Structures are given as structure tokens and as C-alpha cells.
Design a binder for this molecule. Structure first.
Ligand code: CLA
Ligand code: CLA
Ligand code: CLA
Ligand code: CLA
Ligand code: CLA
Ligand code: CLA
Ligand code: CLA
Ligand code: CLA
Ligand code: CLA
Ligand SMILES: CC1=C(C#C/C(C)=C/C=C/C(C)=C/C=C/C=C(C)/C=C/C=C(C)/C=C/[C@@]23O[C@]2(C)C[C@@H](O)CC3(C)C)C(C)(C)C[C@H](O)C1
Lengths: 171, 177, 180, 150
């Protein structure tokens, strides 16, 4: 049931993955999604991790482009502890409301992944599969930005500026 | 069946008839039945010779005539003197090696003035042999890794067991002697 | 097969029936729903536990004897020699453990979790549970040692003695209130 | 004359066993895998002892004062640990195999013939013999491989 293909040339999809939910490419070698109830949760978590990563990879670059230092110099430009406290104090209601699906004690039964904020009515299967696709990039990207900073120590955009003027001798 | 390793697996060729069968042959070196009897001869031989060796490596170092690796040159014995011994030992060796590997006398030549041949004594010969064979292996390796006499090695370990052991010793550049 | 549960009124997963030692209905993240993984997980749980038990005695006991602290050992000892020599020694042993024996095809089919290295015939489905539980305790401990190593930067016996001497001025609260 | 246990079923067979080491079939199976692996390793070595000494890198016995031998030894053993286990196991799972651990998969050209199987071990046997020789010349003289050719 995989029209859009699989993660490895000739690979067999796992038994729990049957091409039914968006952006399934039949990839679960450690079988973390064998339980269906768990896989239901996993789906929401992946989409959320995706949506958080996309705001983050933008926030690590778009400040840098407008000459504000890189993402590891943001500690100089803000009070790190304080903003962290207001972020945790504002996340507390809103994350609770996301998880509870509403404001009432006995749950809401709204879709807590795809709530309904869409005035442009773009909610299609393609867009669901493009949320996760652009998401998996941004997660991979953020995983890069950290590992690039640990192995090097220059800015993200400086590592790109290296690689075009140093194809051989980048790594 | 008492075996060398827990689990209860013996090779097929090692059945449990011969003295010292503990199901130990994971490299299948005695699978062929004709090679087995030769090997049964040479195990006892190696064993007896090592037994003599190990007693001869400790006694002159106790007596204070130097350690076994520095006991040849301390009393002469050059390569010509090992050649004369080797020529002298050859007569008994060819006398031994004229008989077959199937004759029980090839291991057990019958020189028993005290009449102490039982089965208990044959297994005890093979067990003390294999213990002395590993002990000689131990002497050689210790000689190179630690670079001191074996009695020194034993004395340091008894007095300071964490201080001097294989773990300490092997964390320095060990081929030193 | 009555068994206790890890949290008061919960219901256990349906694939955890109590069929195996030290089952307390604990798999919220569903990492053992498939049976073959639950087989490997079981071997891994006992083996990580056994190693944590060795580790935590190894970490505590030389500090008790004044031979040094476990996370400062690498300025007196060369790590790379130690790790080379260790992997040389360990490799055929680990090989044989995973293999199931000495043969290329397994052959001498041994249990790779519970081989028979037991001269006292003490093995029951109870001692198995005791081995697991002691192991889980040690794993939690070795987690503690590592985090305490970073936060307080003193050894674990020192950390204990500090808590005993000054229980209010040496605890997680005071140590995390400060920059650390 | 060929021996009794050593029949002509398997590649690179010449009927050589004066020591009867491979009498048992399962032993011979292990022997075969171990000969092929030893052959395959000895070729990368015989070449790896010439090719980075031709280009101005210094001889095979000079490697000690060009690398950190302890640390490289650690790195090599830390990548051998997974991969040799995977070779031995026939995959990644806890229970063994059914992915043939001598001749696994890597043949997109369909070159697996009995000739090529025999030629793996044929070229290997003198790469082994070569490497056995290469060291012996250095111990009896003091010279490099291409310097031993003079
Ligand atoms: C994960 C999402 C995320 C997080 C945690 C941050 C966090 C931060 N942003 Mg960034 N930012 C983001 C996304 C994010 N941003 C996105 C999507 C954009 C494009 C609209 C930006 C564009 C932006 C600008 C122009 C600036 C920040 C700045 C900051 C810092 C201070 C904010 C403040 O003072 O109020 C703070 C570290 C400020 C800063 O100090 O940058 C170094 C600042 O001047 N952000
Ligand atoms: C494999 C057995 C074996 C071998 C090859 C040797 C060989 C040797 N012994 Mg040893 N020895 C042995 C068994 C052996 N012994 C046993 C079983 C004992 C206890 C009786 C001894 C007790 C012994 C003493 C007390 C001495 C020797 C000494 C010697 C050396 C001089 C012998 C000589 O020139 O006449 C020579 C290297 C002499 C020597 O120079 O040692 C440093 C010496 O004093 N041996
Ligand atoms: C120099 C004359 C001489 C001769 C003719 C022999 C002859 C023999 N030795 Mg002996 N040996 C000798 C000196 C000699 N030895 C000396 C000086 C020592 C040190 C004490 C030994 C220690 C020794 C050991 C440990 C073994 C032999 C064995 C043998 C037999 C088999 C050799 C073989 O496989 O050859 C190929 C044809 C053969 C009867 C072997 C044996 O008995 O196997 C059953 C054996 O294991 N010898
Ligand atoms: C408020 C939270 C809460 C409560 C009330 C319990 C209560 C219990 N736990 Mg659970 N547990 C919890 C959180 C909690 N746990 C957390 C956060 C973890 C880490 C995942 C665990 C991991 C855990 C393990 C590994 C075990 C328990 C067990 C138990 C029982 C132990 C009996 C006891 O007297 O403990 C003494 C203090 C008891 C039902 C044990 C059990 O199953 O006993 C039957 C058991 O082995 N718990
Ligand atoms: C490497 C350590 C390890 C491994 C492999 C296992 C494996 C297992 N546990 Mg055990 N367990 C452990 C440590 C481990 N446990 C610890 C430290 C505790 C004490 C809190 C327990 C307490 C416990 C209980 C009470 C029960 C289990 C059970 C199980 C079985 C089913 C759950 C599962 O598959 O999770 C697999 C686990 C992992 C894949 C570990 C990965 C964890 C991630 C990376 C986060 C950990 C970091 C975190 C900060 C700490 C499985 C065999 C259940 C069982 O049925 O046993 C018979 C059961 O009832 N575990
Ligand atoms: C389980 C894993 C484990 C590991 C990785 C270690 C590792 C180590 N131990 Mg520890 N040890 C352990 C278990 C372990 N031990 C246990 C269970 C005990 C109690 C019996 C000890 C008792 C112990 C003492 C008393 C000492 C060490 C010491 C050491 C260090 C030096 C060893 C050496 O030089 O060459 C090792 C060479 C090979 C393995 C080959 C090394 C980091 C020494 C140290 O420096 O203490 C701080 C030391 O004095 N160990
Ligand atoms: C040096 C060679 C070596 C080899 C071949 C092995 C091989 C193995 N180890 Mg071992 N191990 C080793 C060194 C080695 N180990 C060392 C140096 C340590 C630290 C003391 C460990 C500690 C260790 C732990 C804690 C575990 C293993 C496990 C395993 C098995 C699964 C490997 C895997 O990741 O599957 C691919 C997926 C495999 C049999 C695992 C196991 O037994 O799983 C069931 C496991 O949990 N090993
Ligand atoms: C068993 C196979 C094997 C082994 C153990 C080695 C080992 C080594 N090679 Mg060699 N190499 C090999 C095969 C091998 N090589 C083969 C088949 C080729 C041809 C592709 C090379 C081409 C090569 C080059 C160009 C260089 C090395 C170098 C080295 C050394 C350092 C490698 C490093 O820094 O990472 C190390 C001694 C480096 C070195 O410093 O040599 C002295 C180096 O510059 N190797
Ligand atoms: C594999 C094929 C092979 C080839 C083509 C060579 C070729 C050579 N060998 Mg080597 N050698 C080899 C294997 C090989 N060897 C093996 C397997 C061993 C161990 C027995 C040796 C042990 C050896 C020694 C001790 C010497 C040679 C020497 C030589 C050279 C002179 C030939 C001679 O006089 O004898 C020649 C380049 C000689 C040399 O190095 O000349 C400078 C020399 O002294 N070889
Ligand atoms: C799927 C799967 C598998 C897998 C997998 C993989 C690869 C998982 C990994 C996913 C990954 C890699 C997930 C990253 C998350 C990052 C997040 C959430 C972003 C936060 C980051 C934030 C909020 C940062 C904010 C910043 O303000 C900060 C702090 C500083 C500022 O200057 C700039 C920015 C704005 C940046 C297995 C294991 C292979 C087998 C299994 O069977 C199937």
C-alpha cells in the first residue's frame, strides 16, 4: 500500500506499517510502533517535533542573516534563565490545553494533532504528508547544526560558505 | 560426564574412555582416530617433561643460583653443551620411538618398583602433567611481561595482591625481557 | 500468577502476562509488544544489569580503599591502552556469548542469558527475579553516579559522607540552586 | 594422492591435508570460511604494505613513527567489534543467520562462478605466502619490500 516508495531500495515494510497514515515510508527497524495505541501517540509526537523544529531552524538562521551572531551567541544577547522561565510559564497552560484537547477537566475529543486552525482550507493528504516531510528535514537539519558546532565551532552559514569554496577538504 | 565447560556438549570422537577425556577438543584436532593415539603419547610425554622442567625451574632459584632463564649462562652450558646432551638423549629417544603408538608400553614402560600403577595414578599423572604444562606456559609469558623471576612474581602477588597482578603488569610496555 | 504492579491502580499491557521474572506490568512506551524483541530485550536487561552491578562495586570500592575516584582515573591510567587491551581480551568472550558456543554454527546450544555457570544449583524463577531487581537497582545507581559526578564533582563516597555530615547543605536542592 | 576426508566438492580444492586437520565436515566448513577470510584480509594487507610506501610515505615497518599505534589500534578494534559480530551473526538480530557468512551478497555483476570462488582463494594463498615472506625478509635483512627486490 506504499504508492510513494520505501526508505531502502528493495526493503519490505513492517507489519504494523501498511501505508495508511501520512508520510509512511515503511521505516521501523526497531519496531517501536508495533503497538497501535502507542503508534497513535507516536504520530502526534512526530508531527509536533516536526512543527517545533521548523520554527527553530528558522530561528537559528533568520536572526543570523540579519547580523545578530549565531545561535550559540544568543546567550549574550538575552538573559538566558529569565526568558526560559517565562517560556516555561507560558507553555504550562497552553501545552496542558493541547494535551487535554480543551479547557474542561474531562477532556475535549478534538483532534489534538490537527485541531482545525485553517482559514485557507488547505488541509489535504498532500499537505499532511508535506508537514512531516519538511519536518523530517528540519529535525535532521537541527541535528546537523549541533553536530557541526561540536566538530567545528564557527557559525552555521560559515560552514556553508566553507563547503562551496572547499568541496574537497570540507569534511 | 565431567566436562571442561558447563552445558553438556562433547565432541563425538571424544567419548570418555581414555584418561583425561573432558570433552575438550573445539578445534577437532583428534577427530581422526590414528592421530589421536600419537597425540595421546605426546601429551603424556610433554606432560612428564614439563613436570621435570617446572620442578627444575624453581629449585635452583630457591637455592639462590639465579632464575631459570639466567641459569644456563650462569653455569656455562652453551649451544655445544646442549648439542652433546641432545646426542646423548637421542639414544633413549630412538629406543622409545622404535615401538608403535598403539602399544600401551609407548606411554607406560613398566618401570614401577613400588607397584603403584592403578587408574587413579594414570589420571593423576595426566592431571599433574597438564597443570605443569600450563605452568611452563605461565613461566615463559611471565618472564617476558614482568621481566623478573617467577618466585619474585609469586612473592609480590602474595604480599601486595592488588599491587602486582596481570592487570597492573600488562598496562606497561611489556616485552621487556 | 499474582504479581504486583509498578503504579497503584494501573492495568498491565496484554503482552506482559507475568510469564517471566520481575514482570511488573511496566512497558508504557510499548517497546516489547513484538515477542522477538521482547526476547532480546530480556537478554539485554539482564546483561546491562549485570554490568551495572559490577560497575557500581568497581566504582565505589577502590575509593573506599583510597586508590582514587572512578571518574578521575584517566589522569593516572592511559585510557587508550586500557581500552585496546580490554577489547582484545573481551572480544572472544563476548563473541562466544552472542554466538551460543565455540562453533561457527552455534552447535553447542547454550542459553546466552542463563548458562550453567552455577556450582551451587541455586537457580530458580525466584533468584532470577532477585538478579533482575538487584540489577535494576544498580543501573539506577550508575545513573546517579554519573549525574552526581557532573553536578558535585566529588566522588560518590565523598557525596554520601557530605550528605551524612551536612544533610541540609549537601542535597540535590542546594547543589542545583547554585550554578554548579 | 588426495586424502579420504578431502574430496573435490568445494572451491580451490587440491587435496592438501598432510596433518588431517579438517577431517570432520563441520570443522572443514569452519576451515573454509577462515581460509577465505584470511585470504581476503591478506590481500588488502599485501597491497596496503606497498601502495602507501611507493608514494613517499615510508615502509610498512616504519608505520610506528607515522601514526599513534595505540590510538589507531583502539579505533580499529572499536569498529571491528560491531562489524565482525555482524559478519559472524549473519545480520543484526539476536538469533543467528541465514545470510551466508562467507559469500554474503555483494555481487551486482553476477560474477559468482566456481572459477571466481576458486580465484578468490587462489590469489589469496600467495598473498598470504607473500605476506609471510615479506616479514621474513625484513627479519633476516633490514630492508623494505621493493628494496628486497634489488
Ligand atoms: C523555537 C523557536 C524560537 C525560539 C525559542 C527563539 C528564541 C529567541 N529569539 Mg528567535 N526567531 C524565531 C524562532 C525562535 N526564536 C523565528 C521563527 C524567527 C523569524 C520570525 C525569529 C527571529 C528573531 C529575531 C529578529 C530575534 C529573535 C530573538 C530571539 C531571542 C530573544 C527573544 C526575546 O527577546 O523576546 C530568543 C533566544 C532576538 C535575539 O536576541 O536574537 C539573537 C531577536 O532580536 N528571533
Ligand atoms: C627438564 C628438566 C631439567 C633440565 C633441562 C635441567 C637443567 C639444568 N639444571 Mg636442573 N633440576 C631439575 C630438572 C632439570 N634441570 C629437577 C627436577 C631438579 C630438582 C632435583 C633440578 C635441581 C637442580 C639444581 C639444584 C641445579 C640444577 C642445575 C641445572 C643446570 C646445570 C646442570 C649440569 O650442568 O649438570 C642445567 C641448566 C644446576 C644449576 O646450575 O642451576 C642454576 C644446579 O645447581 N638443577
Ligand atoms: C636428538 C635426537 C632425538 C630423536 C631421534 C628424537 C625422536 C623423537 N622425539 Mg624427541 N626429544 C629430544 C631428542 C630426540 N628425539 C630432546 C633432546 C628433547 C627435549 C628433552 C625431546 C623432546 C621430545 C618431545 C616433547 C616429543 C619428542 C618426540 C619424539 C618422537 C617423534 C618426533 C617426530 O615427530 O618426528 C617426525 C618424524 C621421536 C621418537 C615426540 C613424541 O613422542 O610424539 C609421540 C614429542 O612429543 N621428543
Ligand atoms: C507517585 C508515583 C508512584 C507510586 C505511588 C509508585 C508505587 C509503587 N511502585 Mg512505581 N514507579 C514510579 C512512580 C510511582 N510508583 C516511577 C516514576 C518509576 C520509574 C519508572 C517507578 C518504577 C517502579 C519500579 C521498577 C517498581 C515500582 C514499584 C512500585 C510499588 C512499590 C512499593 C513500594 O513500597 O515502594 C517503595 C518506595 C508501588 C506500587 C515496584 C513494584 O512493582 O512492586 C510491586 C517496582 O519493582 N515502581
Ligand atoms: C538497558 C536497560 C534495560 C533494558 C534493556 C530493560 C528491558 C526491559 N524491561 Mg527493564 N528496567 C530497567 C532497565 C532495562 N530494562 C531499569 C533501570 C528499571 C528500574 C526503573 C527497570 C524496571 C522494569 C520493570 C518494573 C519492568 C521492566 C520490564 C522490561 C521489559 C519490557 C520493557 C522494555 O522492553 O523496555 C526496553 C528498555 C529499553 C529499550 C531501554 C531504553 C530506555 C531509553 C533510552 C531511556 C532511558 C533513559 C532514562 C533517563 C533512564 C524489557 C525486557 C518489564 C518486564 O516485563 O520485565 C520482565 C517490567 O515490568 N523494567
Ligand atoms: C566491571 C567493570 C570494571 C572496570 C571497567 C574496571 C576498571 C578499572 N579498575 Mg576496577 N574493579 C571492579 C570492576 C571494574 N574495574 C570490581 C568489581 C572491583 C572490586 C573487586 C574492582 C576493584 C578495583 C580496585 C581495588 C582498583 C580497580 C582499578 C581499576 C582501574 C585500573 C585497572 C588497570 O590498570 O588495568 C586493567 C587491565 C585489563 C583489564 C586487561 C580501571 C579503570 C584500580 C584503580 O585505579 O582504582 C581507582 C584499583 O585500585 N578496580
Ligand atoms: C569487543 C567485542 C564485543 C562484541 C563482539 C560484543 C557483542 C555483543 N555485545 Mg557486548 N560489550 C563489549 C564488547 C563486545 N560485545 C564491551 C567492551 C562492553 C562493556 C563492558 C560490552 C557490554 C555489552 C552490553 C551492556 C550489551 C552488550 C551486548 C552485545 C550483543 C549485541 C550487540 C548489538 O549491538 O546488536 C545489534 C543490534 C553482542 C553479542 C548487548 C546484548 O547482549 O543484547 C542482547 C548488550 O545489551 N555488550
Ligand atoms: C589491512 C589493511 C590496511 C591497514 C591496517 C592499513 C593501515 C594504515 N594505512 Mg593503509 N591502505 C590500505 C590498507 C591498509 N592500511 C590499502 C589497501 C590502500 C590502497 C587503497 C591503503 C592506502 C593508504 C594511504 C594513501 C595511507 C595509508 C595509511 C595507513 C596508516 C594510517 C591510516 C589512518 O591514519 O587512518 C595505517 C598504518 C596512511 C599512512 O600514514 O601510511 C604510512 C596513508 O597516508 N594507507
Ligand atoms: C611468495 C613468493 C616469494 C618470492 C617471489 C620471493 C622473492 C625473493 N625472496 Mg623471499 N621469501 C618468501 C616468499 C617469496 N620470496 C617466503 C614464503 C619466505 C619464508 C620462507 C621468504 C624468505 C626469504 C629470505 C630469508 C630471503 C628471501 C629473499 C628473496 C629474494 C631473492 C631470492 C633468493 O635468493 O631466495 C627474492 C626477491 C632473499 C632476499 O631478501 O634478497 C635480498 C633472502 O635473503 N626470501
Ligand atoms: C523514526 C525512527 C527512528 C528514528 C529516528 C531519528 C533520527 C530521530 C531523531 C529526530 C530528531 C533529530 C529530532 C529533533 C528535535 C528537535 C526539536 C524538537 C527542536 C527544538 C529546538 C529548539 C526549540 C531550539 C530553539 C532555539 O532557541 C534556541 C534554544 C537557541 C536560539 O538561538 C535558536 C533556536 C530558535 C534554534 C529509528 C530510531 C531509526 C528507528 C525507529 O523504528 C523509527
Amino acid at each position: 500500500g506504499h504508492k510513494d516508495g520505501v526508505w531502502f531500495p528493495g526493503a519490505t515494510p513492517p507489519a504494523h506499517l501498511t501505508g495508511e497514515y501520512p508520510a509512511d515510508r515503511g521505516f521501523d527497524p526497531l519496531s517501536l510502533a508495533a503497538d497501535p495505541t502507542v503508534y497513535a501517540r507516536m504520530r502526534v509526537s512526530e508531527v509536533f517535533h516536526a512543527r517545533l523544529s521548523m520554527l527553530a531552524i528558522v530561528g537559528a538562521i533568520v536572526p543570523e542573516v540579519l547580523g545578530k551572531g549565531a545561535w550559540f551567541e544568543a546567550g549574550n544577547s538575552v538573559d538566558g534563565i529569565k526568558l526560559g522561565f517565562i517560556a516555561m510559564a507560558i507553555a504550562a497552560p497552553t501545552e496542558y490545553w493541547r494535551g487535554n484537547g480543551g479547557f474542561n477537566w474531562d477532556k475535549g475529543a478534538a483532534d489534538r494533532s490537527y485541531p482545525g486552525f485553517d482559514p485557507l482550507k488547505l488541509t489535504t493528504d498532500y499537505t499532511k504528508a508535506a508537514e512531516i516531510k519538511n519536518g523530517r528535514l528540519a529535525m535532521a537539519g537541527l541535528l546537523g547544526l549541533t553536530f557541526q558546532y561540536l566538530a567545528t565551532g564557527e557559525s552555521p552559514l560559515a560552514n556553508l560558505a566553507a563547503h562551496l569554496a572547499n568541496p574537497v577538504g570540507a569534511n | 560426564r565431567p566436562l571442561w565447560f558447563p552445558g553438556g556438549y562433547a565432541p563425538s570422537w571424544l567419548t570418555g574412555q581414555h584418561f583425561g577425556d573432558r570433552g575438550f577438543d573445539p578445534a577437532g584436532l583428534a577427530a581422526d582416530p590414528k592421530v589421536f593415539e600419537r597425540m595421546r603419547v605426546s601429551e603424556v610425554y610433554h606432560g612428564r617433561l614439563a613436570m621435570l622442567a617446572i620442578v627444575g625451574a624453581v629449585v635452583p632459584d630457591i637455592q639462590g643460583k639465579g632464575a631459570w632463564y639466567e641459569a644456563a649462562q650462569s653455569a656455562g652450558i652453551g649451544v655445544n653443551e646442549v648439542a652433546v646432551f641432545t646426542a646423548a638423549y637421542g639414544i633413549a629417544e630412538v629406543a622409545r620411538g622404535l615401538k608403535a603408538n598403539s602399544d600401551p608400553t609407548s606411554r607406560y614402560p613398566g618401570f614401577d618398583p613400588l607397584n603403584l600403577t592403578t587408574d587413579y595414578t594414570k589420571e593423576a599423572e595426566i592431571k599433574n602433567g597438564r597443570l605443569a604444562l600450563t605452568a611452563m606456559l605461565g613461566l615463559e609469558v611471565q618472564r617476558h611481561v614482568t621481566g623478573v623471576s617467577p618466585l619474585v612474581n609469586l612473592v609480590e602477588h602474595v604480599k601486595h595482591p592488588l599491587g602486582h597482578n596481570i592487570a597492573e603488569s600488562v598496562m606497561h610496555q611489556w616485552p621487556v625481557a | 500468577k499474582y504479581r504486583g504492579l509498578w503504579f497503584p491502580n494501573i492495568t498491565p499491557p496484554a503482552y506482559l502476562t507475568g510469564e517471566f521474572p520481575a514482570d511488573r506490568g511496566f512497558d508504557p512506551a510499548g517497546l516489547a509488544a513484538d515477542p522477538k524483541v521482547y526476547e532480546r530485550m530480556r537478554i539485554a536487561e539482564v546483561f546491562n544489569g549485570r554490568l551495572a552491578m559490577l560497575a557500581i562495586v568497581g566504582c565505589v570500592y577502590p575509593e573506599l580503599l583510597g586508590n582514587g575516584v572512578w571518574f578521575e582515573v584517566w589522569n593516572k591510567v592511559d585510557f587508550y591502552r586500557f581500552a585496546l587491551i580490554s577489547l582484545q581480551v573481551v572480544a572472544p568472550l563476548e563473541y562466544w556469548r552472542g554466538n551460543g558456543g565455540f562453533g561457527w554454527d552455534g552447535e553447542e546450544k547454550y542459553d546466552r542469558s542463563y548458562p550453567g555457570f552455577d556450582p551451587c544449583n541455586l537457580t530458580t524463577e525466584y533468584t532470577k527475579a532477585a538478579e533482575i531487581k538487584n540489577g535494576r537497582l544498580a543501573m539506577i545507581g550508575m545513573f546517579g553516579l554519573e549525574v552526581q559526578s557532573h553536578v558535585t564533582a566529588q566522588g560518590p563516597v565523598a557525596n554520601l559522607i557530605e550528605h551524612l555530615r551536612h544533610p541540609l547543605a549537601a542535597n540535590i536542592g542546594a547543589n542545583l540552586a547554585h550554578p554548579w
